Paper text:
To explore the functional consequences of this rearrangement, we mutated δL516 and δF443 independently to alanine (δ[name] and δF443A, respectively). Strikingly, we observed that the δ[name] mutation resulted in a decrease in FAM-ISRIB binding affinity by almost an order of magnitude (eightfold), whereas the δF443A mutation reduced FAM-ISRIB binding by twofold. Similarly, the δ[name] mutation strongly decreased nucleotide exchange activity, whereas the activity of δF443A was only slightly reduced. Thus in the absence of the steric clash driven by δL516, the δF443 rotamer and [name] as a whole default to the I-state orientation. To further test this prediction, we determined a cryo-EM structure of [name] δ[name]. After two-dimensional (2D) and three-dimensional (3D) classification, we generated a single consensus structure of the [name] δ[name] decamer at a resolution of 2.9 Å, with most side chain density clearly visible. Consistent with our predictions, δ[name] exhibited a ‘wings-down’ I-state-like conformation. The two tetramer subcomplexes underwent a rocking motion that changes the angle between them by 11.6° relative to the ISRIB-bound A-state. Close examination of the δ[name] switch-helix confirmed that δF443 defaulted to an I-state ‘up’ rotameric position. Critically, in the δ[name] structure, δR517 also formed the I-state salt-bridged conformation, reinforcing the notion that the salt bridge and rotamer elements of the switch-helix are functionally coupled.
Residue numbers in the entry:
A (entry chain C): 8 to 98, 125 to 351
B (entry chain D): 168 to 351
C (entry chain B): 41 to 279, 285 to 458
D (entry chain J): 1 to 10, 24 to 60, 73 to 80, 84 to 135, 157 to 237, 297 to 334
E (entry chain F): 172 to 517
Write the structure that this text describes.
Amino acid sequence: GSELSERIESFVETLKRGGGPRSSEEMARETLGLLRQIITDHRWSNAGELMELIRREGRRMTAAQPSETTVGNMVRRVLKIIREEYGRLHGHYAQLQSNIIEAINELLVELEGTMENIAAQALEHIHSNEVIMTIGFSRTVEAFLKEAARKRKFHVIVAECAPFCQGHEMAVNLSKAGIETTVMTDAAIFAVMSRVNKVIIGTKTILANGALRAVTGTHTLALAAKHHSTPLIVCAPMFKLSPQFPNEEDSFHKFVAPEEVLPFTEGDILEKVSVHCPVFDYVPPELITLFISNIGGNAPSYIYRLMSELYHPDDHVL
Amino acid sequence: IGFSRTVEAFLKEAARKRKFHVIVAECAPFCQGHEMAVNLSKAGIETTVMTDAAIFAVMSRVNKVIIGTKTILANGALRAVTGTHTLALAAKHHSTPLIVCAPMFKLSPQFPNEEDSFHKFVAPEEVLPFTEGDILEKVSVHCPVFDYVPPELITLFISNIGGNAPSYIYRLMSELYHPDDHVL
Amino acid sequence: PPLQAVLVADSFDRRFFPISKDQPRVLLPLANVALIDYTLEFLTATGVQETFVFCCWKAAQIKEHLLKSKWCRPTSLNVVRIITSELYRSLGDVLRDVDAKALVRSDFLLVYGDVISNINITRALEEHRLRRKLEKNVSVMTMIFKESSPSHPTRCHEDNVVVAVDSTTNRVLHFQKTQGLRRFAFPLSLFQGSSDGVEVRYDLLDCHISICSPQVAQLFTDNFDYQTRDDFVRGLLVNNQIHMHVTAKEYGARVSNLHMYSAVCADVIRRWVYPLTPEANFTDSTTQSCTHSRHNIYRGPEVSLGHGSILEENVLLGSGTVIGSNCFITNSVIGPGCHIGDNVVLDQTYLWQGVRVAAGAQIHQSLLCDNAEVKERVTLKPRSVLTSQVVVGPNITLPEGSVISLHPPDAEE
Amino acid sequence: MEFQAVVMAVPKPLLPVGNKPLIWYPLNLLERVGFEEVIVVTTRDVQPDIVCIPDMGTADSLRYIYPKLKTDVLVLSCDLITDVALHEVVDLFRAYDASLAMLMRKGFIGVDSTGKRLLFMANEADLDEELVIKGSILQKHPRIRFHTGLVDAHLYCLKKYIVDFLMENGSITSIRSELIPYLVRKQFQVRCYVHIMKEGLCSRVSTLGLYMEANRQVPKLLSALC
Amino acid sequence: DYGSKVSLFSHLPQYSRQNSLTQFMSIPSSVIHPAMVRLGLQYSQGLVSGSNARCIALLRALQQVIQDYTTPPNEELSRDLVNKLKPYMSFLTQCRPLSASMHNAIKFLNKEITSVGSSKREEEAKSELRAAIDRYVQEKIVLAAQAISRFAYQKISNGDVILVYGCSSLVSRILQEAWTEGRRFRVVVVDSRPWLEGRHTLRSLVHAGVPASYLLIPAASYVLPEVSKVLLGAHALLANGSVMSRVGTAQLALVARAHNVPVLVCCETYKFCERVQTDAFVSNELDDPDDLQCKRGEHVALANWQNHASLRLLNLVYDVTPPELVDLVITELGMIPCSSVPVVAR
């Protein structure tokens, strides 16, 4: 009844006015739960109206915050599941809901298992007496390093982001487990080159041409890695695959208040100074080497193949 | 790669204060790198040797490359033993600096003007044995001993006046040899 | 207990009275969004679950505008109640009415209808409640300030104050304005009566946001001589304690004059009030959709930008606007439905809906109200306010500070 | 040199504070980091090098000994028993190239956020009712910290031009009452800095209660001093 | 030393801003001149940070010492002045590592002192030493800056977008002179933690009427496509053609090259060094690691970083820039390519 609508506006408002869950896995889980509840307690006598309603809700969620491509992936996966069930049955109208609920539950179980599946492949790409560099705070790279360091010993260098110094928390968490981490600013990135053996970083999402969207300063790291010919492996689960190619996207990066960059107490010079604080950036696909996910490492040229199964081509525009 | 007295003295002088690892690449025609490898091994340096086919395979953990040369051309190019071009290409691909220590008397004020005598050829016995059989009448075997290294693959040049860039050779040539005697 | 707030829509001062003869101050658009909408959004985001709106003059317009807003929808977490009374003359009157009506039952917020801020009150309220419980109801008010610089353009001389507080526990001991004052004076009671922090702060911006107490209304009603909050806070510290809080990363200001209105609008355009941005569309209105571009350039639907026009800096363009050729717009806000001509230069100029500008006009640091018209070869000096429906002819030049209105007594006509 | 170590003391200097003369403590403090020459001004009670000169206030004696001094003068008080290192106050005079270095300890003056620069100073006697601060000081320094329970050690690091200016005018007689407020009010280049210890003794013996407190406080200081 | 250093930088000192050594020193200093101790205190406190300002202050202190110096009996001034100045240089280095300009200045002063005639009177020796120091300062700072600005003015056109990084007294002078001459353009300011020295030049440009923009170094890739030219300062010129400057310069030049943006470097001829460097590990300066702490949110994440044995903080200051990423180098003698600086410097 009204409870579903109330949860819908609450989710939309908490997505729009600010950030939601700290981890993307929880966000995906609650998006799947919201979609399942929408499917359950709604009146729909055929698949077409259900898909239309799901598409409308996905469009509303995307318009709430387009900077994050997490809810839209869940909407597209649900639409693909609906289409697959309809093709299996009609190719009906009686046991569709139970099949949909089962598909949602298995998808949730797989999403829960992605973390362990990714963490299980830590020892293959990491050796002893190696130098690994990470930028920012990521829950996947941290698990990778902590699983790889329980059997070997290496060196990790963590660089924090200038506006949001989230790398300090990552360095503290790693050093609490005995990894011998280092803390340094973004300026000394080219200087620290020529001594790093491997680069392992995360990303917010993966584009269609193999590109990815990550925190600011990742483009400089990729350029330095390409200049020094060091491998660059990105660990990201399967729900970060965005089926949209990189367009012009003048609003690709998220712009926040200039308070983080420049304090409000600067004086009268703030009336004629332009301050911009982008959050994300664009990394060309040619600067990436490997893509580690829950089904195994894959080349950047397998992104379209991986995406084709996940999302139906007609749902790319949603 | 190869046997260079200057490079051997350069490497063996710094082993007393610091401990490092040295990788030595042999030479297929004449395995003169094994003598250098054993000479460095009998110095407390902990060196290793391998064939010429593994130059690119192990070009990942190498942080510095030091090699010698026979002569230096007028454009900063080098004429070292054969197979050094592959090493320079691998170093450029992996962005590992390649620094060459050569004395001041190996400076030749000449350009590679398609002389075709840059790589002198020796008897093909060292490559293919004479006891191979009747196939020697049809097979053509060439055994070059020198290669051409473009100056763009060189990082630094050690001299008596200190390390110099590959683009500074002409300044030394202007004061070393009179331009009227370049033809001899 | 659920959080409550009291909103005073009517501004009893007449600072904005060349123009207010047709529309109230709360309905004046800053970035094509009403100020009362900004205040309602701030209250909803801060956690207020019940808002009381008091309207005194032009109450019908505010009441009919509020119903069309999204905050009056049934699926809302902030119930808005509109109270209209023609007997109101000052904030003290509305506070006495609230005391007599027993509307408030716990701590509530007291804000005006033209306050634009993004401050989330979740720690200041907590410490206010803690210090109220520990001392058994001695603190009655917790005013909110914002640390800034005295040279900031957002610090108007008519809204500049200097206070003396206690470093150990934040508590206001002296409050006075600095309007036309060169040598400020502080009473000796602070130094000779107490110690452990008697520092004086002159880097605080008045956000006009306060956390009140149920007994504040009773204190207001007991003395039948209080009109504004400044008089109350000045009279309380003459004998109940008043405390204070400072924010450092958020933003907050109240539109009082044209200078501060322009400063707040410029800050909003430059994303200083994030996430309250023109492209965010917090009002949930179909006609206010916009897209963000480089250099803080905002364009809505059907912009119809011409060939040769240059947007040098942050420019806001409404829906249905028409732009000619060889134009130059920078640091300007354009309302929906405007019709600009050719070779028109706009710098720090604010245009509302329905404004038509002829070719060759040069407008600098001016304000144009609804349905304003400018002929050709007309130059507008800085700080030239044009009221609604002005038909100023061609071949004329308005000097600095010129105000033209339809009403005869308002300067010119 | 760099300092002159004025120990102006105009049998109070010979009072038995801790079985030692009252003038011994400032002299002992001075004879710990260099300071091979000391100028002492007092009456006929004189008994490391010490240059005594029987002679009034403080500025009058400073003008009397003006020809003797050729560099900055370190003004010291006759009654001063402190355990604070002089480097903490000397650093403010050196690094900032200030005109006056001053020392206080917790038991009206104004300091900035850092708490090391003197902005405003006024005693209760000078002001009648209202403490008035100019708007310029607030414009340059928004936050001002006020202290009311501080004591003065009469430890000032004067410059040369300050003494030159004081020489030509005899209106100022007491340094503590006329000179420091003049410099404080003149800077709003002249710079005045202060130092707060907050954990030491900084005892100035001027009353019977202070005399007995100093007597109680000597032994634990002397256990480490000697 | 303060704290624990990383393995890669175990050969470089790491001091602290609060570990001032003046506590164990006599207040009327005699072994060390008061000018030197004041200069060391100012250097440790961070009052003077400019590359030219430090050299100017050092030369002024040396002139002050020479003014009040007396010759010891039966000892030549030229044979003992260097020996007396050596402990002052050691103390200054202990307070804070010196720079290329200071090294060149002290080398020139030693060469001047060693060349002083034995029969010259002490007052004449002091007066000529002061005159030589003043002439050197003039010709090496205020005559070189004007020539560099004049040379760089020809490379600035209307509508240009110039990107600058950090604080530099030479770049700011060039920009102000170009704006005063009649050029119309805008500047882009890039800053990096924790020094944030670009705010000074941003304020200088704002007060001069030149439009400017502010952003951090992680976002330089977003603003580079709209940047026409990149102007950077230099701290020292090496013998192999590389340029030594602030740590945020080499990566900026690399990203500018990746975006096909020319890079210009302005430096004086007196900053040349007879040294060859390839990486920023064989020679660098380490600052206080406590400066990396940031007040983000409601607490500091690195408040107790010393309590963790596996936590290290690294505070690089300088770095090297390969000549491949530098297009044009402007000196006081003329515009030259980056791969030709040793020819003109020596």
